[PDB]
């Protein structure tokens, strides 16, 4: 029991994916340098923490997807898959059956160049509440000012306003393996 508001997901034409997205090249470590979402909120008091998604691509061209985080004095790992969907550089969550509450989970990488940055946005339905995020990777911990004005502009146009949009702090524990 509950009630929540939320800012209205975008409609996908509003998502660009990335032109000749190629799979292999996306592999390896990403940081995860902004957040934006319509539940991302700026929290003075106990700031985000920078944590790492690892991307392995399977035979079958799946993606297994592993995310450290920082949390409570440990290393926490959580490992889920992506599964190709309409056009290179969509996936669907694999097994979405598995996770209660949930009904449908979308991923599409907007743009990257491999081997410095990426956005990807993220769109789910969890109790039937429509969750949206878009997520700015970096192969390193900092990113430009230019390239973190380019994600706020990009988050502000799929209806975002500037107190949900995040920067985690780098942090050295867990996410250097
Ligand atoms: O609104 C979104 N995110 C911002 C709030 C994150 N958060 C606060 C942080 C929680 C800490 N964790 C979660 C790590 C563990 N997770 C899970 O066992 C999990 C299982 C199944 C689906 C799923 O989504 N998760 O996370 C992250 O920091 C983390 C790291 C990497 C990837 C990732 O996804 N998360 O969350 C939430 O509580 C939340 C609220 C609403 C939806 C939602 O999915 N989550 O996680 C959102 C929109 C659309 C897809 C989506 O995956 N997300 O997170
Ligand atoms: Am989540
Ligand atoms: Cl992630």
Known sequence: ????????????????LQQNFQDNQFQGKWYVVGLAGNAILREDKDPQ?????????????????????????????????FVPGSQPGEFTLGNIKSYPGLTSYLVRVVSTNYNQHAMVFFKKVSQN?????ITLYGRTKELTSELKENFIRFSKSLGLPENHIVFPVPIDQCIDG
């Open 1 to 16: 029991d509950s009630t929540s508001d939320l800012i209205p997901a975008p409609p996908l034409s509003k998502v660009p």
């Open 49 to 81: 923490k920078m944590y790492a998604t690892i991307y392995e691509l399977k035979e079958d061209k799946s993606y297994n997807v592993t995310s450290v985080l920082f949390r409570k004095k440990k290393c926490d790992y959580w490992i889920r898959t």
């Open 129 to 133: 509440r429509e969750y949206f995020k």
